[PDB]
Every structure is written in C-alpha cells, then in structure tokens.
Amino acid sequence: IVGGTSASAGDFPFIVSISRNGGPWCGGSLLNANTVLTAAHCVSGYAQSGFQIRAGSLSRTSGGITSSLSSVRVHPSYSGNNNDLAILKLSTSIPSGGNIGYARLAASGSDPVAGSSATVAGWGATSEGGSSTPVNLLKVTVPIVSRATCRAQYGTSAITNQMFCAGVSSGGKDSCQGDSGGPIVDSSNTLIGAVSWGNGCARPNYSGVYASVGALRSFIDTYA
C-alpha cells in the first residue's frame, strides 16, 4: 500500500495474508471457515503447497491462525487480467471470533459508484518496485473512478464489466505489488473487490484496477 496508514485490530476481521515459499506474496479474504477469496493471478498454476494463509493478525508472520491449502479454483473465465478471482479451500478450518470474522460481500450485480470512498489493505510495498514491505497491515482510502475514466486511462478493452477502478488523479494512494488478492471494501466494510492490477503503483492518472465482487458473485457463491 502506497500512502497508507496502519490498520487497527479488527478493521478487517476477514483479511488473510497469503505467504508463498515463506515470504510475502498476496492477500485474501476469509469467506467462511473453509474458504479464502483471492486474485487468480496470485495462485493460478503455482504449486499449491507453497502457500500459507494466516487469519486474525496484523502481521503476516505471527499471530492468529494459519492454514495450508486443500485446493485452488480460478474463475472459469479467467483470461489475462480479466475475471481475476480464485477460491481457495483451506486444509484447516478457521473459526470466527475475536479479531477473526468472515467477509460480507457486495450485492450481486452491484457496481461501485464513481466518487464513493473505498478502502484497500495489504502487506505489499510502499512504493512502486520497493523491496522492503511492512510488518503490519496498511490501509488507504481512495475514491472509485468511473469505468469510463478508467477506460480512458487503460483502453476500452482493457477494463471489463468484471473490473472497477479506484485512485486519485494526482496519484500517491494505491495498492501495489504484494497487495494483490487482498480486500477493497466500501465505506460500510462490505467487500467490493480484490486487488488485481494497474500501471505501476500510485502513478498519476493510472487507477488501481480491482476484480469486482459484485460482478463475480455467481462464481463466488457457487464455490464458497
């Protein structure tokens, strides 16, 4: 996260860190005791055993409850950056309670309205290409950018009905590498997306692009 502040305990009861090979990699969202939602690109085709989920902590490396993966399922229409969601099943069930809880999801067919305030969180870099990452979870608030403006920035084909965008024109506030798969929420803390892609991080006039939970509820609901 670029331009962020430290998340408080319980800000995102459902957030998980996704380590790979013991190191930082992605974020995700705990949907139920047995299931994490993340970005497809975080997991597609990689060795499944390399991943470790941790819930209930502000750190990636201690606290809370861990699990390995039992299975990985990408969206059936995943292609390039499009439809960038995956369902992970956990080898260890994680109970809610305390600072762990399960996400509530954006309504099917909803689409975040331009100008509304969204909050994104993760353990990723704090600058584009930064090598160091924070121990504790960061968050930042950015407005939704209309799909039309996002298509002006990236091209018409590049931004689909299963993506939405968020950021500020001046840049300086965004998700970055290592934040992929983690949550973006609306002002009510309802999960509206997963961190997906963008042109660099926090650049002027290049929004962050998010996989849209509202657009992808059939897949989520079927397999969660």
Side-chain angles (χ1 to χ4, degrees):
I1 299 289
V2 181
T5 65
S6 308
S8 298
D11 277 354
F12 310 97
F14 58 82
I15 195 172
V16 302
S17 61
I18 304 185
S19 298
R20 185 183 172 213
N21 296 318
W25 185 248
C26 281
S29 296
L30 192 65
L31 300 187
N32 59 58
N34 290 305
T35 307
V36 166
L37 185 68
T38 190
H41 78 262
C42 288
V43 292
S44 184
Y46 295 130
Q48 290 182 18
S49 54
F51 296 108
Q52 188 179 61
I53 277 52
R54 182 184 302 276
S57 186
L58 298 173
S59 172
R60 180 182 66 79
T61 52
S62 67
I65 303 296
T66 61
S67 183
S68 306
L69 300 184
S70 59
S71 68
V72 172
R73 181 185 296 269
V74 306
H75 192 285
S77 298
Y78 180 47
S79 181
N81 295 145
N82 199 17
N83 308 313
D84 191 13
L85 290 180
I87 288 284
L88 319 183
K89 296 292 173 160
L90 300 185
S91 305
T92 301
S93 305
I94 301 182
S96 62
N99 285 313
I100 300 174
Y102 306 137
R104 292 302 300 267
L105 302 176
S108 178
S110 66
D111 185 17
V113 176
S116 65
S117 290
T119 301
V120 59
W123 290 271
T126 61
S127 62
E128 183 182 327
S131 300
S132 287
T133 60
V135 169
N136 282 190
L137 183 63
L138 294 175
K139 64 179 184 181
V140 69
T141 297
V142 284
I144 302 302
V145 171
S146 71
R147 186 170 298 92
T149 293
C150 205
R151 284 173 172 159
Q153 297 173 346
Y154 288 102
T156 298
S157 298
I159 313 297
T160 70
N161 290 350
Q162 305 81 225
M163 297 173 194
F164 72 87
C165 301
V168 293
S169 6
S170 60
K173 291 188 163 187
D174 203 356
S175 53
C176 196
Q177 280 57 61
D179 294 319
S180 289
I184 179 164
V185 297
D186 69 12
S187 58
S188 305
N189 286 324
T190 302
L191 185 67
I192 58 171
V195 176
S196 180
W197 65 280
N199 183 28
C201 305
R203 299 192 180 182
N205 299 308
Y206 288 95
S207 304
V209 191
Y210 296 87
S212 178
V213 165
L216 297 170
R217 283 294 299 273
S218 188
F219 170 67
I220 298 167
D221 295 350
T222 296
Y223 295 106

